[PDB]
């Protein structure tokens, strides 16, 4: 009698679902999944970049982890804004050179309007490449946990170095430009909340079943509770 066949029946894996809904547009599913994949590679590049920021590597490893998790959407939307500005044709979202969403060709109306905002603001202020690099470094240090960092004295000393660096990049009474540029940085918090909210909706939506790389899925998984508990301290340059 076949004793092993019964033991094979016990260990047989259950049937898995694909997470496929025909009603979800293929163009929508493709664009969003393709962008989540690109976001994963850009996120790995960003970790490598942050480690090459003078002073970043001095912070506690848990603080380095925290900052990259709290700011990833901010660096992504701000670099997307820059690339879209450097394309010279307004109303374009230059995600990648091979994937340029020409705004013309309304589920992502609220989303697209917040992504275009960064591009339109950079074009309005005529932001140079030296100002952009200081600003992008400052978005990495723009949000902290409500309780605070394990290397807070060092973090504050590092953040002050890049605010000072942004001032040098502008420098007669140019402190109005410093006001205008730090105002754009402050408005990034609102952009990120609208994009992070849509990101969490597609991360958890099983009818749509949009795919994400393991790098982003781990950041999103870790941040969803902190976002809901309001455990984030947005550092501002100007009072709301």
């Amino acid at each position: 009698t076949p004793t092993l066949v019964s033991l094979l029946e016990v260990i047989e894996p259950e049937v898995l679902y694909a997470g496929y809904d025909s009603s979800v547009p293929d163009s929508t599913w493709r664009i969003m999944t393709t962008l989540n994949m690109l976001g994963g590679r850009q996120m790995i590049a960003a970790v490598k970049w942050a480690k090459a920021i003078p002073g970043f590597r001095n912070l506690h490893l848990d603080d380095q982890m925290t900052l990259l998790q709290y700011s990833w959407m901010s660096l992504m939307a701000f670099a997307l804004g820059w690339r879209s500005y450097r394309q010279s044709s307004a109303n374009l979202l230059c995600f990648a050179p091979d994937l340029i969403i020409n705004e013309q060709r309304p589920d992502m109306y609220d989303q697209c309007k917040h992504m275009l905002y960064v591009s339109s603001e950079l074009h309005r202020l005529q932001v140079s490449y030296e100002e952009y690099l200081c600003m992008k470094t400052l978005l990495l240090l723009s949000s902290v946990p409500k309780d605070g960092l394990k290397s807070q004295e060092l973090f504050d000393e590092i953040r002050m170095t890049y605010i000072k660096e942004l001032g040098k990049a502008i420098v007669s009474q140019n402190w109005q430009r410093f006001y205008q540029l730090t105002k754009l940085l402050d408005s990034m918090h609102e952009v990120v909340e609208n994009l992070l909210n849509y990101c969490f909706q597609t991360f958890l939506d099983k009818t749509m079943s949009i795919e994400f790389p393991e790098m982003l899925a781990e950041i999103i998984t870790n941040q969803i509770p902190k976002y809901s508990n309001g455990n984030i301290k947005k550092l501002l340059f100007h009072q709301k």
Partner: peptide
């Protein structure tokens, strides 16, 4: 996990 790996190296 993956972030900690990329920061460890």
């Amino acid at each position: 996990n993956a972030l900690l790996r990329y920061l460890l190296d």
